[PDB]
Copies of this chain bind each other. A is one copy, B any other.
Amino acid sequence: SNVQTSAQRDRIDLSHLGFLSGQIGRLKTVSFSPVIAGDSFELDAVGALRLSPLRRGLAIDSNVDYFTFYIPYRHVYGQTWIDFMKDGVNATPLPTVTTGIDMDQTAYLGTVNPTSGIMPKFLHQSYLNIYNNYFKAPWMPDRTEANPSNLNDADSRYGFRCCHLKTIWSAPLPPQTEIAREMTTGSTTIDIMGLQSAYAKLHTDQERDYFMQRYRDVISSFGGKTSYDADNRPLLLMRSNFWASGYDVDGTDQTSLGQFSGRVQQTFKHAVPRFFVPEHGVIMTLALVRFPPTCTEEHHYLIGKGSLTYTDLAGDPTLVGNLPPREIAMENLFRSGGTGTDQKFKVAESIWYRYHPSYVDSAYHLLEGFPFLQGRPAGNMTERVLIDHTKYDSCFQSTQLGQWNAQAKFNVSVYRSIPTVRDSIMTS
């Protein structure tokens, strides 16, 4: 009888609750919401973050980060998505990915794993794109797992391991750093105009080692700019950063009179400005919890080197600003550090005059309840930069909620051109 061809703008409420938990230094999705082209989106999240109960009182605060991204479906499917919308009703169904059989094999995607073992691929593919563009180190290779079932238990359960806060050892110079550059002069002659050309080519190589390892960085150096559709990267909408604090509880019985237990409870807000959605896609929110990288057995570089030369100590501007980067070992910074090839990296020529490390007294070593890196970070450069959550197990009491937990309410309001429920159920 009466065929409907259009719809008014209606206020849709997409608010819901979230019960979240995770580990230290792993990225995990906490909320998502699919969107349609032409929508007007707004988000506001309010909740409280908690850590597991501590073995002692409060010593060090933790840092919490919240992120929101928008990913069009065209970035995930490509040409398949283009033909999908042009065909219309008789379009081919989109491809899928395979998941595991347990209930928690997709916890990093913020959803319960369906019993069928099959789910759409836009959440898994959007997670990889975010990680490879914003969170991993620029010099390490991308993650290219095809299906969620290809991950190990740790990655699927809690998320991918992220990088420590920047220090001398956790933010070294990239591995493709050269300390020498050779030329092909003659046996008894040299071209000096050719020498000038050699320095010019070395300058462009050093630019791409320190600043420009991505395509959008190269364009930015010329003074241009690239849209997020040019390099197929997710669009960041909002970032929030805050510190979590709490209070202490005192024991009052015979045995525990004089000891204390700390609990962390912090309220937060994550507000995203109004956004106009240009195409069909998804909007995802993620969280990250980290501690400042304090190590017990770390000392000053001048203390660790022992025998000091004029270059080390004088701080002469002519020598500091004209020498190639120096290669140092982990032994020079940590007790029992290594000397082999895997314990070697390169730093600035006088970096020790621009920072001072933190000191932990030997009375605090091997003491439960203090969030510390006991000893030194182990492994090669890749394992040294990435955070390992199992090293923080000595700070918390064993519980089923991991190392941190939160409860938040996401206030989502969208203006959508969709027919009402009454229109959908009445034939005439």
Closest chain-B Cβ to A79's Cβ sits at a distance in Å of: 10
Q: Are A224 and B1 in touch, CB under 8 angstroms?
A: no
Chain B residues with CB below 8 A from A200, complex form:
3
Q: Are A226 and B279 in touch, CB under 8 angstroms?
A: yes
Q: Are B203 and A3 in touch, CB under 8 angstroms?
A: yes
Task: List which A161-202 residues lie within 8 A (CB) of chain B.
Answer: 192-193, 196, 199-201
Q: Are B86 and A222 in touch, CB under 8 angstroms?
A: no
Chain B residues with CB below 8 A from A36, complex form:
222
Task: Answer yes or no: A85 CB below 8 A from chain B CBs.
Answer: yes
Q: Are A278 and B38 in touch, CB under 8 angstroms?
A: no
Closest B residue, CB atoms, query A193: B427
Closest B residue, CB atoms, query A200: B3
Chain B residues with CB below 8 A from A196, complex form:
1, 3, 427
Given A38-B224, A224-B38, A227-B227, A218 and B3 touching (CB < 8 A)? no
Chain B residues with CB below 8 A from A417, complex form:
222-223
Q: Are B3 and A37 in touch, CB under 8 angstroms?
A: no
In the assembly, what is the distance between CA of A200 and CA of B424, in Å? Answer: 13
Closest chain-B Cβ to A257's Cβ sits at a distance in Å of: 66
In the assembly, what is the distance between CA of A203 and CA of B230, in Å? Answer: 34
Chain B residues with CB below 8 A from A279, complex form:
219, 224, 226, 230
Task: List which A383-423 residues lie within 8 A (CB) of chain B.
Answer: 417
Task: List which A213-236 residues lie within 8 A (CB) of chain B.
Answer: 213, 215, 218-219, 222-227, 229-231
Given A224-B277, A226-B279, A203 and B89 touching (CB < 8 A)? no
Chain B residues with CB below 8 A from A1, complex form:
196
Closest chain-B Cβ to A152's Cβ sits at a distance in Å of: 31
Closest B residue, CB atoms, query A81: B215
Task: Answer yes or no: A60 CB below 8 A from chain B CBs.
Answer: no
Task: List which A83-117 residues lie within 8 A (CB) of chain B.
Answer: 85-86, 88-89
Closest chain-B Cβ to A35's Cβ sits at a distance in Å of: 10
Q: Are A278 and B224 in touch, CB under 8 angstroms?
A: yes
Closest chain-B Cβ to A283's Cβ sits at a distance in Å of: 15
The count of chain A contact residues (Cβ–Cβ below 8 Å) is 41
Chain B residues with CB below 8 A from A82, complex form:
215, 231
Given A3-B199, A88-B204, A215-B82, A222 and B37 touching (CB < 8 A)? yes
Task: Answer yes or no: A5 CB below 8 A from chain B CBs.
Answer: yes
Closest B residue, CB atoms, query A231: B82
Task: Answer yes or no: A208 CB below 8 A from chain B CBs.
Answer: yes
In the assembly, what is the distance between CA of A212 and CA of B3, in Å? Answer: 21
Chain B residues with CB below 8 A from A85, complex form:
215, 218-219
A37 is contacted by which of B37, B201, B204, B223 (Cβ under 8 Å)?
A: B223
In the assembly, what is the distance between CA of A82 and CA of B222, in Å? Answer: 15
Task: Answer yes or no: A365 CB below 8 A from chain B CBs.
Answer: no
A278 is contacted by which of B192, B201, B212, B225 (Cβ under 8 Å)?
A: B225
Closest chain-B Cβ to A81's Cβ sits at a distance in Å of: 9
Task: List which A253-300 residues lie within 8 A (CB) of chain B.
Answer: 277-279
Task: Answer yes or no: A205 CB below 8 A from chain B CBs.
Answer: yes
Task: Answer yes or no: A74 CB below 8 A from chain B CBs.
Answer: yes
In the assembly, what is the distance between CA of A279 and CA of B218, in Å? Answer: 10
In the assembly, what is the distance between CA of A131 and CA of B218, in Å? Answer: 31
Chain B residues with CB below 8 A from A204, complex form:
88-89
In the assembly, what is the distance between CA of A277 and CA of B201, in Å? Answer: 26
Closest B residue, CB atoms, query A72: B230
Q: Are B38 and A205 in touch, CB under 8 angstroms?
A: no
Closest B residue, CB atoms, query A74: B230
A201 is contacted by which of B89, B199, B205, B213 (Cβ under 8 Å)?
A: B89
A-B contact pairs, 9 of them (CB 8 A): A38-B222, A38-B223, A82-B215, A82-B231, A219-B278, A224-B277, A224-B278, A226-B278, A227-B229
User: Which residues from chain A sit less than 8 Å from chain B, CB to CB?
Assistant: 1, 3, 5, 36-38, 74, 82, 85-86, 88-89, 192-193, 196, 199-201, 203-205, 208, 212-213, 215, 218-219, 222-227, 229-231, 277-279, 417, 427
